[PDB]
Copies of this chain bind each other. A is one copy, B any other.
Amino acid sequence: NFEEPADAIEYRQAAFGLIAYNFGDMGAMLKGKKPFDAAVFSTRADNVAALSKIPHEGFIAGSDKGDTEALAKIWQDKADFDSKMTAFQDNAAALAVAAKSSDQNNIKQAFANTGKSCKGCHDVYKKD
């Protein structure tokens, strides 16, 4: 569905920028930068879970050139990339469900598990 590689890059960059903004607001609440607000937290969690479904489609073959932070390694080891992306989606979904209840510890763990997805993929597949 992408006419040019720049379109696939823009698609996936846009999605991750939206992810990072919404995920960072949950982090701010859990880290104590701002008070925990259950209603906003749940919107943020719902948003990350839905947005997690988006960027994978942009990682098309032949889109490592130009203005992207994606490494060529993605396409050398695509099944591992895909495994990490799936695990991220599943972790984000689990965070959304945790955010529908009051148990704070369950939220904290789900957030942490999701965060470990970001870092695990970042470390292998994104430019420093």
Bin chain A's interface residue count.
Answer: 10 to 19
A47 CA to B10 CA in the complex, in Å? 17
A10 CA to B50 CA in the complex, in Å? 19
Q: Is the CB of A14 within 8 A of B18?
A: yes
Is A1 close to B, CB under 8 A?
Answer: yes
Determine how many copies of this chain the complex contains: 2
Is A54 close to B, CB under 8 A?
Answer: yes
Interface of A is mostly: helix
A64 CA to B126 CA in the complex, in Å? 34
- Residues from chain B with a CB closer than 8 A to the CB of A53 are 43, 46-47
A10 CA to B88 CA in the complex, in Å? 24
Q: In the complex, given contacts A14-B15, A18-B54, A51-B51, what are 9 additional A-B residue pairs having Cβ atoms less than 8 angstroms apart?
A: A1-B25, A11-B17, A11-B18, A11-B21, A14-B14, A15-B18, A18-B18, A47-B50, A47-B54
Interface residues, chain A, with chain B CB atoms under 8 Å away: 1, 10-11, 14-15, 17-18, 21, 24-25, 43, 46-47, 50-51, 53-54
